[PDB]
């Protein structure tokens, strides 16, 4: 509905979808077209973690002083004006000779773009009454989807009309001028509660790691898929050079929206377990077909059909994941667990990036996607294991706080506690190879073995849930 507080929800939402594709899809397509190797492309999926560690910064924008303006109006300009510079300065840097400055800029793009969504979400919650909520939320998501396709298919195709990839990022700076103008045209309106408290409930529940792995491992197939999909459709098969964006993304986005609606339509007649399983199994067969393109290039329509089906069985299953997330949040502090669980669901998406790139080199393009169909099985296989623990949520909404102590819990978590610090400790070793300050020939030897041991602590910890679910 057209009203003075309607266009802002679309343009401001357009300011949130534009940078999301630029740090993930177009940058990947920028590296793919510029002959940047597959392994480094997968490492660039890590800069997408800024959108999933946004839960930490959400308290920050409130406690930290509002710069130059109100807390909600001013901070949105700050992340928009930073992006208008960051996106433009990104186009100044050329893949090939200069990636580290481009990579560092991508993180700042990622850091500010997630700040763009956080401040807008804070603005979307203060300005939207319950009566008008959803009406503006649908409008906001519509602009986000429009911004995704403008920075997705429209950006990639504009990169072929443009004599180079420089202009497409430069035009995003030009297209972000209305975003700031919309921000200043709009009349202006905790870490413990938002972050610390939800972890206690998720870690105090009897399900604990069984739901945690089920939350994480479910979209593993869709995480190994997608990801390098833009590189694949560009560097793998003849449907190359820009048509990927207008088909893999433009039709891919439409596939998710129609699928997500179907994920809210058939869920009425489908049990949550019977919906998560059927959509997850269909999610597994959805990844099949990416192997079909990787074998023989029959035609473009093979990508167009599969991209629809890939997102259809994924986006519709995404609604099943969203429904599952909603059944695991208490009414006491709902809408924060969903933010935390979805963000913490992407803790498992972190490992996908480097493994996605590393797998494609050693093992061929068909093998990685034939691995994807088996990659979603652990999410499904755990769902069948977690069938009983999802039944209590459907029957009577409650949480079992009895952890039983998991036998000897110090053998479960405290074993993996060092592993959490090991990622930061490994990052200290990461600078060593770049700057040659300290010689450690071990390098990644300790990171690989102990991280699985750290995961094994979750694995044996999740093993403790099933044996302790008897009591």
- 3-state secondary structure string across the chain: CCCCCCHHHHHHHHHHHHHHHHHHHHHHHHHHHCCCCHHHHHHHHHHHHHHCCHHHHHHHHHHCCCCCCCHHHHHHHHHHHHHHHHHHHHHHCCCCCCCHHHHHHHHHHHHHHHHHHHHHHHHHHHCCCCCCCCHHHHHHHHHHHHHHHHCCHHHHHHHHHCCCCHHHHHHHHHHCHHHHHHHHHCCCCCHHHHHHHHHHHHHHCCCCHHHHHHHHHCCHHHHHCCCCHHHHHHHCCCCCCCHHHHHHHHHHHHHHHHHHHHHHHHHHCCCHHHHHHHHHHHHHHHHCCHHHHHHCCCCCHHHHHHHHHHHHHHHHHHHHHHHHHHHCCCCCCCCCHHHHHHHHHCHHHHHHHHHHHHHHHHCCHHHHHHHHHHHCHHHHHHHHHCHHHHHHHHHCCCCCCCCHHHCCHHHCHHHHHHHHHHHHHHHHHHHHHHHCCCCCCCCCHHHHHHHHHHHHHHHHHHHHHHHHCCC
Instruction: Tell me the CATH number for domain 1-189.
Output: 1.20.1250.20
| Domain 191-401: which CATH number of 1.20.1250.20, 3.40.50.720, 2.102.10.10, 1.10.10.1100 | 1.20.1250.20
Identical fold, 1-189 and 191-401? yes
Domain assignments of the chain as residue spans, ordered by start: 1-189, 191-401, 404-468
């Amino acid at each position: 509905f057209q009203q003075p507080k309607s266009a802002i929800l679309l343009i401001l939402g357009f300011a949130s979808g534009l940078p999301l594709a630029l740090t993930s899809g177009t940058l990947q397509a920028w590296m793919t077209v510029e002959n940047i190797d597959l392994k480094t492309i997968g490492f660039f999926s890590l800069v997408g973690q800024a959108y999933v560690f946004k839960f930490l910064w959400s308290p920050v924008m409130d406690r930290y002083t509002p710069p130059f303006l109100g807390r909600r109006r001013g901070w949105l300009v700050t992340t928009q004006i930073l992006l208008l510079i960051a996106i433009a300065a990104m186009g100044f840097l050329e893949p090939g000779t200069q990636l580290r400055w481009m990579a560092a800029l991508a993180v700042v793009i990622a850091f500010c773009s997630a700040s763009q969504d956080i401040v807008f979400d804070a603005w979307k919650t203060d300005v939207l009454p319950a009566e008008e909520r959803g009406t503006g939320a649908a409008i906001s998501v519509l602009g986000y989807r429009l911004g995704m396709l403008v920075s997705g298919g429209l950006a990639l195709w504009m990169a072929d009309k443009w004599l180079g990839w420089q202009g497409m990022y430069w035009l995003m700076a030009a297209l972000l001028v209305p975003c700031i103008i919309a921000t200043l045209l709009a009349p202006e309106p905790t870490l413990e509660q938002a972050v610390v408290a939800p972890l206690r409930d998720f870690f105090g529940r009897n399900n604990a790691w069984l739901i945690l792995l089920l939350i994480v491992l479910y979209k593993l197939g869709d995480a190994f898929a997608m990801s390098l999909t833009t590189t694949f459709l560009i560097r793998g098969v003849g449907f190359d050079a820009g048509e990927v964006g207008m088909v893999n993304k433009t039709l891919g986005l439409i596939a998710t929206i129609i699928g997500a609606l179907y994920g809210g339509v058939l869920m009425q007649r489908l049990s949550l377990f019977r919906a998560l399983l059927i959509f997850g199994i269909l999610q597994g067969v959805s990844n099949a077909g990416y192997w079909l393109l990787s074998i023989t290039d029959k035609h473009l329509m093979s990508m167009a059909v599969a991209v629809f089906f890939e997102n259809l069985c994924g986006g519709m299953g995404t609604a099943a994941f969203v429904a599952l997330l909603m059944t695991l949040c208490n009414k006491s502090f709902s809408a924060t667990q969903f933010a935390l669980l979805s963000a913490l669901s992407a803790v498992g998406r972190v490992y996908v990036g480097p493994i996605a790139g590393w797998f494609v080199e050693a093992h061929g393009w068909p093998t990685f996607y034939l691995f994807s169909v088996f990659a979603a099985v652990p999410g499904i296989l755990l769902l069948l294991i977690c069938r009983k623990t999802l039944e209590y949520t459907q029957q009577t909404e409650s949480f079992m706080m009895r952890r039983h102590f998991s036998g000897a819990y110090q053998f479960a978590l405290y074993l993996l506690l060092l592993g959490c610090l090991l990622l930061a400790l490994w990052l200290i070793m990461l600078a060593l190879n770049a700057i040659d300050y300290t010689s450690f020939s071990f390098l990644a030897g300790l990171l690989e073995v102990a991280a699985l041991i750290a995961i094994a602590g979750v694995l044996l910890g999740a093993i403790l849930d099933y044996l302790a679910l008897r009591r």
